[PDB]
Design a protein around this ligand. Structure first.
Ligand SMILES: Cc1cc2nc3c(=O)[nH]c(=O)nc-3n(C[C@H](O)[C@H](O)[C@H](O)COP(=O)(O)O)c2cc1C
Ligand SMILES: Cc1cc2nc3c(=O)[nH]c(=O)nc-3n(C[C@H](O)[C@H](O)[C@H](O)COP(=O)(O)O)c2cc1C
Ligand SMILES: [Zn+2]
Ligand SMILES: [Zn+2]
Ligand SMILES: [Zn+2]
Ligand SMILES: [Zn+2]
Lengths: 398, 398
């Protein structure tokens, strides 16, 4: 209800969403809700950075009024136009028709598309352009595909404050606002779940952007994303993390996701696992119909190996295994080795589909024609899987 | 606990599984449990038809012993070798090592695969072979792929009793055993849920099989499946139902399955629905992340149109929509018209995938390049969808 000062004249005026359990419709599971972060920079001219998810506009406005009532607003920065950040645009614009919009070109197009019927003053910004607010100013950095084509970060020189919008955020609801008021390991895990499910496909763009920021030698003292905690005590940690994740070196870990109807594919999953562990490798095993897809993807970000298994039903794979596969193809895991496996009763069919989809995700099969078994595994069948797991372990070496 | 007599000398000795909520691993959802039906025919020689899911072997044996304790068993018929019916094979075979197995060739192969280490006396049966038990006898009818390659039905002429194993069954748990002690509409619906998710792919085989039985002019006075209620009062209904479902004529109904992240695909689903309803069509609308895939498939059995929609995320379809698509390809719905639709932000990509998978399920698209919208629908966009729903209605005619 109350705004929170990041420093004098700079306030967090977002909204906390405790009860939301799924983001992007079904796409992302938020076991602990999330927040919609918006920032108010007060000066000779005052600027509001991003807005809020439409259902929380009241909270935005109520917080704005707590800093200064008749909401002033000279500039309204729109770093991103998805709905969780631009949904309260009509309301804010209605509250200050004179507000000057600062956004990218693609942003401007999106904004006219999602709202039209709303006229407003503006200026398309590009990497490097800068507006002054008086004592402080805000410069911009275009971030195409650093989630969306319209994406961009805002930087406040005078304070070394970076406002990347989605980048560096984590989906978590707390009444506390800063990284130093939260458990280090828990918040870094949320951050990884975030990266893995949203930024994984743009890993190469992340390093490029990180380097650009590195060259220009930008001083970053605090990072305020659009979701979650504000990295005020140690931005370095999250920046180093993004670099490692985007590089994709990985860790000597393997994720095995699968499902079964009568346990044979499971017995194979188990043997494969034993081989992987014997080869000195950490293993995470997921029975998909009982695990969270986003929690599985998060584990894959650091894994060097991804094994997926399934029996064949009606000459296809088991439908619970589909989500993970189409999600992998779209997320484009970088630098991963893999394997498909599973049982069958007569003709088979799921193995082709599994290898097809795994290759479409650019994951290199450690073995064209993966382990397959008819009806039930026998001693040598499980032994072969064990050896295979041992092979994968040797390659994921480290 | 107690066996139930179907008629003197013929008893139901199966087990009721009240708490199972998912069958075939994740594949089939059993909102109300299921049962594993097995029958004991007593005569000069006594025969047991099918056994029971391994975890319920004690109930089987306990029931057998209440009929006659030293379990006698001269013949053990194995109509089907999946585990829900042959899981207690070891235990029965160890209780009567001399039992004579009567099964198909493919059954015999499966049996040696899933068990080996168990030898038993037997005789491969074919359509027409018949064994006598004294006063009554049992004749067999091979039923390849009427679910499994090893499937077959058992017929007891003296009583006009058909024991089809899975065919004609329904996944439902009740303490009552017969169709006349259950609501007609509820049991027929469960029967349809069953047919749609298991038998839909073999609808052509179903009519052939129904015809062969028709010509041979078999007197069926009672049908005792391997799951659910026993059709003892009106076998006709369930046989006529299978005929109509297998035929695939359908009904003037349309199923629309979809999901969205921001509501545009939903608004399109809505428009398409209005057109379909305006054209005199019944419509079932399913938001996939909140509906039961099996419940959705059941509705498609009767539908003449199947519309599937999805926005595009990372150049792919939304992962929640995958299960239904791969399940439709494998189930091969007979004689269906369809359409794919959805929104997108820039490049698109889900429409291609949707149409491909829809074709792969041999569903005739009522329009290659289905309705697609960028960002949000505008008036003409929804109008167009409305017209399309209107068009499909016209074809679904009736
Ligand atoms: C409804 C159902 C449909 C099936 N369809 C096929 C099929 O099309 N092709 C095949 O080769 N096996 C088929 N099977 C057999 C399974 O692939 C086989 O039983 C396997 O051992 C099960 O693997 P699991 O124990 O890992 O679940 C089917 C089994 C069931 C229950
Ligand atoms: C995480 C996320 C990833 C996206 N990826 C793509 C993409 O690869 N290609 C595209 O054309 N649009 C993409 N979009 C844009 C959506 O397709 C677009 O916003 C659409 O309007 C959402 O459909 P809906 O309102 O039915 O949920 C993406 C949107 C989000 C939120
Ligand atoms: Zn409040
Ligand atoms: Zn082990
Ligand atoms: Zn009991
Ligand atoms: Zn309406």
């Amino acid at each position: 209800s109350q705004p929170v000062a990041i420093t004098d004249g700079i306030y967090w005026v977002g909204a906390v969403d405790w009860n939301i359990r799924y983001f992007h419709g079904p796409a992302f599971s938020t076991h602990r809700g999330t927040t919609y972060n918006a920032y108010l920079i007060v000066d000779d001219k005052t600027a509001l950075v991003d807005t809020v998810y439409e259902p929380f506009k009241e909270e935005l406005i109520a917080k704005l009024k707590q800093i200064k009532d008749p909401v002033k607003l000279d500039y309204l920065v729109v770093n991103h136009t998805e709905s969780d950040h631009a949904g309260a645009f009509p309301a804010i614009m209605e509250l200050c028709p004179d507000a000057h919009v600062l956004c990218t070109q693609r942003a401007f197009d999106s904004l006219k598309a999602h709202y039209s019927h709303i006229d407003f003053n503006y200026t398309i910004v590009k990497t490097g352009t800068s507006v002054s607010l008086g004592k402080r100013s805000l410069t911009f950095i275009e971030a195409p595909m650093l989630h969306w084509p319209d994406s961009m970060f805002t930087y406040v020189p005078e304070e070394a404050l970076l406002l990347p919008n989605d980048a560096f955020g984590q989906h978590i609801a707390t009444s506390v606002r800063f990284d130093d008021q939260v458990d280090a390991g828990l918040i870094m895990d949320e951050a990884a779940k975030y990266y893995a499910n949203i930024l994984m496909p743009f890993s190469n763009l992340i390093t490029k952007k990180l380097d650009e920021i590195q060259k220009i030698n930008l001083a970053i003292k605090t990072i305020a994303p659009s979701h979650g905690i504000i990295w005020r005590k140690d931005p370095g940690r999250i920046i180093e993390a993004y670099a490692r994740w985007a590089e994709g070196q990985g860790k000597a870990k393997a994720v095995i996701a699968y499902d079964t109807m009568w346990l044979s594919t499971e017995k194979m999953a188990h043997a494969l696992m034993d081989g992987l562990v014997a080869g000195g490798c950490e293993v995470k095993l997921f029975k998909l119909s009982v695990s969270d897809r986003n929690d599985v993807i998060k584990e894959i970000l650091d894994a060097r190996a991804v094994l997926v298994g399934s029996p064949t039903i009606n000459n296809d794979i088991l439908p619970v295994v589909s989500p993970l596969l189409d999600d992998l193809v779209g997320l484009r895991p970088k630098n991963k080795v893999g394997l498909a496996f599973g049982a069958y009763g007569w003709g088979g069919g799921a193995q082709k589909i599994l290898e097809e989809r795994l290759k479409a995700a650019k994951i290199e099969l450690i073995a064209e024609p993966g382990p397959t078994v008819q009806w039930v595994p026998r001693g040598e069948d499980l032994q072969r899987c064990y050896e295979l797991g041992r092979k994968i372990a040797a390659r994921i070496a480290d």
